[PDB]
Amino acid sequence: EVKLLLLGAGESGKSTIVKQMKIIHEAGYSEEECKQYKAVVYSNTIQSIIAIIRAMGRLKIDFGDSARADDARQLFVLAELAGVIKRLWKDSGVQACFNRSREYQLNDSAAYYLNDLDRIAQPNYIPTQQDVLRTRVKTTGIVETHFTFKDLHFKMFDVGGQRSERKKWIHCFEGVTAIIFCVALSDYDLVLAEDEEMNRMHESMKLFDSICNNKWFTDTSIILFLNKKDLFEEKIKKSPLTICYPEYAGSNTYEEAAAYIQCQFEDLNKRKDTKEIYTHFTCATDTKNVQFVFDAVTDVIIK
């Protein structure tokens, strides 16, 4: 028996890692399961394309084709709609505002789903597991989940990260064996939606610090997932780190940055001496990663 807790700031991957704890250590998602997500899929997909639209009407961008302005007038109506969206997804234009997502709030899967629409409009569509992992739903108040692995009983707690939620965390603080803190690597240039004026990796650091170092967690295994490496690894190829860290003097490469960052985080340990941090680089959506890692992880706890 085993209290596990997952923490992080908002949209860091937590709830996805919970999803796999389940595909991994159980059967995963069924059809009738897959199917109840159908509807999220679709939700997500709409709100994303819309937010891009919307966004253009602020950033003032211009569709590729004048033609697409009906298709847009008519997205809203509305909400054959796939047609619309497809069609828009592919305006040169809209894709410029999508490449600018960080001047706004767009979900992360926003392209995964959009880019795969033919596949999931066709009626009689059933989500896959990745389809399902890639979905978004805000976690609030806290969800417990059980499972046994390697012959422990894990009791897993899943919270929300927006700040507004952090409020209710303390009620889960007793008795904790392990924590997995998730950080979105790709956050290095985004600001917080609760607070446009905060960098998101900044806020994450703060928090980490406050957990890593919290007096309840002193005999707790602190595990840090840095995550979204997929996404990082792309970003990093065209947005620069100096944005989070204006003093980075390296080059911007997955390799070099990931590590700077690996680092800025690991140094907020105030007991580098007494207390170790066990850090992994993650893709919550990759099932094969995570499962890999979470083996690592447990065989640590075993301590």
Binding site: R163, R166, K167, W169, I170, E194, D195, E203, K206, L207, D209, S210, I211, N214, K215, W216
Partner: peptide
């Protein structure tokens, strides 16, 4: 100010 019980929640 900023914290909630060791926890950083924001100003």
């Amino acid at each position: 100010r900023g914290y909630y019980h060791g926890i950083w929640v924001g100003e």
